[PDB]
Design a binder for this molecule. Structure first.
Ligand code: MG
Ligand code: MG
Ligand code: MG
Ligand code: MG
Ligand code: MG
Ligand code: MG
Ligand code: MG
Ligand code: MG
Ligand code: MG
Ligand code: MG
Ligand code: MG
Ligand code: MG
Ligand code: MG
Ligand code: MG
Ligand code: MG
Ligand code: MG
Ligand code: MG
Ligand code: MG
Ligand code: MG
Ligand code: MG
Ligand code: MG
Ligand code: MG
Ligand code: MG
Ligand code: MG
Ligand code: MG
Ligand code: MG
Ligand code: MG
Ligand code: MG
Ligand code: MG
Ligand code: MG
Ligand code: MG
Ligand code: MG
Ligand code: MG
Ligand code: MG
Ligand code: MG
Ligand code: MG
Ligand code: MG
Ligand code: MG
Ligand code: MG
Ligand code: MG
Ligand code: MG
Ligand code: MG
Lengths: 94, 85, 200, 113
RNA sequence: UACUCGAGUGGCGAACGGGUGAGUAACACGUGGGUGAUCUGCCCUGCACUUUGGGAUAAGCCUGGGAAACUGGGUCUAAUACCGAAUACACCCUGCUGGUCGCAUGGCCUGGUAGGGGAAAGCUUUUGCGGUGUGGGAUGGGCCCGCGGCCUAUCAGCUUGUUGGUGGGGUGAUGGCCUACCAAGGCGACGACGGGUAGCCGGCCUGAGAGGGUGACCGGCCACACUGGGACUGAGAUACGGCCCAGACUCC
């Protein structure tokens, strides 16, 4: 009774990652950009709808995004402190 | 240092730590030997020096002085260095 | 800790007979003491207090016992008054008294406490023993040959045994089958007032 | 180094024991991965209950049960089932069924009448 | 004689177990994921094996300080202790060369090809344990992320490795993590930087409910060992009965 030298493991499916879409408001830096993300929640006590915005640091390699443009974004592994967001594709420009 | 067990463990720790320091000194000597070889910019001397360095690092990983992944990454660094320069 | 003082004094003070064989109560129905004839202002608090005192001191139960009886009845899915009266009647002392083997609650309680009876073939001595539906109560020979027990069993001409209770033979075996209903218990006094007060 | 442990639950005068698979560095009463069986010393039947499938799976994946757990495995039949030498035999003794209250009442009523 | 074993070399255990809440307004905790960027003795299960040569020392003996712990000098000894060489192409690197995926680099197909290198210890004769490199389990872990959870403008601007990028170093790991060169920025009234309080959660109390207080025991994490710094060990370190240094106290 001789067994094979290779024993394949279980193919763990690759997991999903958070995806978001927002607007770029400044690109003065090099291959980095600002995108604002908007969220809506109900106040736990009063129930009011409250609008909030976030500032996130995205990753780029060519600086193809102009000011005041809608863009799609994605999650990546870390590259710089407080910079943990990545570009996928641009959607709207003006 | 209160009971025989820990005093003996102490003794052994200092002894084999002297041994550890000797070996680490040897590895660090190989490392900076490669460093100044690269700084000077030798090619065949660097070739045999890095052969010896890789041998020493592999043996250190084998006897547990350094992590085998650490040795592999160090060797890859040497290769990248010699190919860029 | 049982009650040692007089049993007639509570009946005299609260204005209604308890044992039923109390000659002094009918002799002097007015409240005892030096000024029992004086008028007393009527009040709901007074009324509720009299009802609860009547119940607790007539059944000889202890105060915390009655309190968690009430809490259990309230937690019971059924109506609180019915649950309370049923669990209160479930006490073994009252069970034997209504079975007719006992002439007084005090003596019945002492007999149960000393444990002259057998429960499912095992001797149990607890005056506040819980008795549930479809149970069996036996009698020991040391009780059968006991003189007062013989007197009770040969002179059991008291009020008729209730529906849920019934004796089968000379051994004085007591059985319970179904859950008493307030109407067929027909206990004196009322329970709505007591439950209201304990809700207060 | 997962080993099956007995967790002390219950009461002092009659201890109650569960059968648990957990790491050797966890507590006697703390972290657990699964609950698989139990032990009752007070009842002279000595009631034994265990999940055969889970026990077999753990023995296969490589648990190292202690001496008392191994003894319980022999008693139930799991250890010898795994080893395959004698086979599968059940040495456990079930608690004596309690005679029905209804038939006790019927017999008592018949005796009375 | 090894049945037995003082002390001494040599393995394993010794970060387990057990206590506490000063420090923290923080990924620290729960919650749900990512790790194509990660490691992992002792267990189980497979693959190929497990050659050779040598020096040294404790111990023991002689001896000096000295009540003391401990310590200097001379002689001397074995091991699975230490060190060369025998291969290894399932391992790690560099140059050339195909298919899929997208998560962007690039990953995977153990893709293919040229060159380089990578180690072992025996005892026992009994329900046997060990030594090297590689594939898979299970636990053990490491980094990161969206949401949540005190008061306070009688605290209005803060920061210079601070922000973004290029070459090197580094660790196991991606990374201003560090260094050298470039650009001047990032966060800010949707409350930064400041000041006061406090370990967190499953729970407990109260309350129909929303809501309010609280963290007893038990259960899961975070941090600490007179105070403040530093480093080696190891697969694993805030290393509470491990080590070096600075201060207060106590004892011979
Ligand atoms: Mg960088
Ligand atoms: Mg130096
Ligand atoms: Mg060698
Ligand atoms: Mg038992
Ligand atoms: Mg010895
Ligand atoms: Mg051993
Ligand atoms: Mg610890
Ligand atoms: Mg350890
Ligand atoms: Mg603890
Ligand atoms: Mg305390
Ligand atoms: Mg505190
Ligand atoms: Mg401190
Ligand atoms: Mg603060
Ligand atoms: Mg967390
Ligand atoms: Mg946490
Ligand atoms: Mg010596
Ligand atoms: Mg020798
Ligand atoms: Mg060796
Ligand atoms: Mg391949
Ligand atoms: Mg090679
Ligand atoms: Mg070789
Ligand atoms: Mg060898
Ligand atoms: Mg394997
Ligand atoms: Mg593995
Ligand atoms: Mg995890
Ligand atoms: Mg997160
Ligand atoms: Mg939160
Ligand atoms: Mg900075
Ligand atoms: Mg600078
Ligand atoms: Mg590095
Ligand atoms: Mg930098
Ligand atoms: Mg409640
Ligand atoms: Mg609440
Ligand atoms: Mg609180
Ligand atoms: Mg607490
Ligand atoms: Mg706790
Ligand atoms: Mg400390
Ligand atoms: Mg102190
Ligand atoms: Mg301190
Ligand atoms: Mg280490
Ligand atoms: Mg370890
Ligand atoms: Mg320790």
């Amino acid at each position: 009774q001789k067994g094979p030298k290779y024993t394949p493991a279980a193919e763990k499916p690759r997991g999903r990652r958070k995806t978001a879409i927002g607007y770029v408001v400044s690109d003065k830096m090099q291959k980095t950009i600002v995108v604002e993300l908007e969220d809506r929640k109900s106040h736990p006590l009063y129930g009011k709808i409250i609008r909030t915005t976030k500032k996130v640091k995205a990753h780029d390699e060519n600086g193809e995004a102009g000011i005041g443009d809608r863009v799609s974004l994605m999650e990546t592994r870390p590259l710089s402190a407080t910079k943990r967001w990545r570009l996928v594709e641009i959607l709207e420009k003006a | 240092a209160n009971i025989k067990s820990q005093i003996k463990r102490i003794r052994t720790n200092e002894r084999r730590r002297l041994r550890n320091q000797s070996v680490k000194s040897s590895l660090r000597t190989a490392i900076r030997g490669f460093r100044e070889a690269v700084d000077a910019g030798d090619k065949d001397k660097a070739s045999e020096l890095l052969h010896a360095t890789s041998r020493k690092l592999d043996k250190a990983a084998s006897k547990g002085v350094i992590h085998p992944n650490q040795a592999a990454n160090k060797k890859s660094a040497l290769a990248l260095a010699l190919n860029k320069l | 800790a049982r009650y040692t003082g007089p049993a007639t004094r509570k009946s005299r003070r609260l204005g209604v007979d308890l044992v039923g064989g109390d000659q002094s109560f009918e002799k002097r129905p007015y409240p005892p003491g030096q000024h029992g004839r004086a008028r007393i202002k009527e009040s709901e608090y007074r009324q509720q207090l009299q009802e609860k005192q009547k119940a607790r001191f007539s059944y000889g139960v202890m105060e915390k016992q009655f309190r968690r009886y009430y809490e259990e009845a309230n937690r019971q899915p059924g109506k609180t008054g019915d649950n309370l009266l049923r669990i209160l009647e479930s006490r073994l002392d009252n069970v034997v008294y209504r079975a007719g083997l006992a002439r007084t609650r005090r003596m019945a309680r002492q007999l149960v406490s000393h444990g002259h009876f057998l429960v499912n073939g095992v001797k149990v001595d607890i005056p506040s023993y819980r008795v549930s539906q479809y149970d069996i109560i036996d009698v020991k020979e040391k009780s059968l040959n006991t003189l007062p027990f013989q007197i009770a069993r040969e002179t059991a001409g008291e009020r008729p045994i209730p529906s849920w209770l019934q004796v089968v033979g000379e051994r004085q075996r007591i059985l319970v089958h179904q859950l008493p209903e307030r109407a067929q218990i027909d206990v004196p006094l009322t329970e709505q007032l007591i439950v209201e007060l304990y809700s207060k | 180094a997962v080993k099956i442990k007995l967790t002390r639950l219950g009461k002092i005068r009659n201890p109650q024991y569960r059968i648990i698979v957990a790491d050797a560095r966890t507590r006697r009463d703390g972290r657990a991965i699964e609950v698989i069986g139990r032990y009752h010393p007070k009842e002279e039947p000595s009631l034994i209950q265990i999940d055969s499938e889970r026990a077999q799976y753990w023995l296969g994946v490589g648990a190292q049960p202690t001496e008392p757990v191994l003894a319980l495995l022999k008693i139930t039949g799991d250890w010898q089932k795994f080893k395959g030498l004698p086979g599968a035999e059940g040495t456990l003794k079930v608690k004596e069924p309690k005679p029905s209250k209804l038939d006790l009442f019927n017999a008592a009523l018949a005796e009375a009448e």
